[PDB]
Every structure is written in C-alpha cells, then in structure tokens.
Structure 1
Amino acid sequence: MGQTTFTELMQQLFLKLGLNHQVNENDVYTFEVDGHIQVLIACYHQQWVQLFSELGADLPTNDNLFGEHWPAHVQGRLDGKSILWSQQSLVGLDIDEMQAWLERFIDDIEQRKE
C-alpha cells in the first residue's frame, strides 16, 4: 500500500513461478530466464509496475506503436543499449494478470533477439 501491495504481489508471483530472484535495496526485483534474459521489475510512485529488459545484441528500430500487446511493450534506448519495457498501474492488478503480462513480455524479448 502501495509498496506493500507491490511487495506482496511480487512475493506471490515468484512463488507461483518457482523462480530464483534477487531484490535490491530499492525494491527492484531481478530474475533471469534461459540463462540470458534478465528481467527487472520495479514499482514507481507506489502505483506503477515497470518491466524492463536490456535487449543484448543490436536490434532493429521499432516504430513503437501501441496495439500489439496490452499494455504495450516499448523499445527504447539507454546508454546506447536497446531496451524493452512495459508498464501498468498497480490498482486492481492481480497475480493472474501479473503472471500473464510477464509471460507475454518474456516471449516478445525471446522473439526480438531473434
């Protein structure tokens, strides 16, 4: 509430996923899939859950249009590194949708790599 709601949501998530993870002092949750995809999960302003992943080799530019995923997955740049991110509001976010969104996000990264 809102960090506590986030922390209890993260706890349910990692249990349901049976995934090793890390949490730093900033409440940023880190995990790795398939020994290469590192995914970061953070809560901003006690309200917005933010997914983030660094896209690794150099990837072609995305038109960054909405419509393909809900919420959208956005390909950005950062220190000259392509990254992918997606966000949604914590309000009325539950574990089933949190799990589905994470799955969607992982599948897109997996595909963008290619």
Structure 2
Amino acid sequence: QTTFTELMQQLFLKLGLNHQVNENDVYTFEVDGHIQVLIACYHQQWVQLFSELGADLPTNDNLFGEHWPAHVQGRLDGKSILWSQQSLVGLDIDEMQAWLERFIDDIEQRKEPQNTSPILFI
C-alpha cells in the first residue's frame, strides 16, 4: 500500500520541478502566474491540493461536475482559495500529475478571466 510520501517523492522526481517540502511534510511549488500549489495529506488518507488565489473573486456556485474531483472555491482571510481533494487509496502517479495540471489550468483561468458548457452532466 503506497504512502503519501512515496507517491509525492515519485511524482516530483517525474516532474523535475523546484519545490519545497515543509517540516509538516506539506509539498509546495510555484509556477508562472504567481501560482503556488500546496499538496497535503490528512491522516494518511485524504490528499488535498490548495492554492491561495490572491484576490476575493466572484462567489462561485461551487457545483460538482466540472472537474473530477471537484475544484472548490472557498474563502479564507478575506480572499479566494481553490482546493480539491481525493482519497490516497488508488491515487496513482498519472492521476496526480493530470490532477495537478487541470488544477493549475483552472487557477490560471480564474485569476485571469479576460483571456482570448452551460450544462453539467452525470
């Protein structure tokens, strides 16, 4: 059964990105657009992605369906934070990398909307 540490070490070897691991074993890295993504695991069971979006953005309806797992836009210290979670069990390297990629793409879109489906389905 793969631990969070093993997973994240394998992932960062794969990605070749500059990153930090704090002394609470939270992984952090930053990419262009001043986007810092944090990955943390609770109780060796739940993996979270998190990013402070740096502004108080328009309140998102926060439905499920647009992303799997969902990307939820919350509010902390008067500013928007985006987060997404899923269980560690069954989480694999290809899933982590794809999840990170779509989470970052979502962040970029939300932080800069003025770039160049109305219906959600089960």
Compute the TM-score of the two structures, normalised by the length of structure 1: 0.94
Q: Deviations over 1:11-60 (max 9, x none)?
A: 11111111011111111101001150000000001100000000113311
Partner Cα distance (1:102, 1:29) in 2: 12
Partner Cα distance (1:4, 1:99) in 2: 16
Q: 1:81: Cα distance to partner?
A: 1.3
Compute the TM-score of the two structures, normalised by the length of structure 2: 0.88
Residue pair 2:56, 2:78 contacting (<8 A) in 1 also: no
Equivalence for 2:53: 55
Equivalence for 1:112: 110
Structure 1 SS opposite 2:3? helix
Aligned residues: 112
Structure 1 SS opposite 2:49? strand
- Unpaired runs of 5+ residues, structure 1, are none
- Unpaired runs of 5+ residues, structure 2, are 113-122
Pair 1:43–1:31, CA change in 2 (3 A): same
Q: 1:4: Cα distance to partner?
A: 6.7
Structure 1 SS opposite 2:98? helix
Q: 1:112: Cα distance to partner?
A: 0.2
Higher alpha-carbon Rg:
2
Partner Cα distance (1:66, 1:85) in 2: 13
Q: Deviations over 1:42-84 (max 9, x none)?
A: 0001100000000113311100000000000000011111100
Partner Cα distance (2:95, 2:74) in 1: 24
Partner Cα distance (1:34, 1:13) in 2: 19
Partner Cα distance (2:77, 2:57) in 1: 14
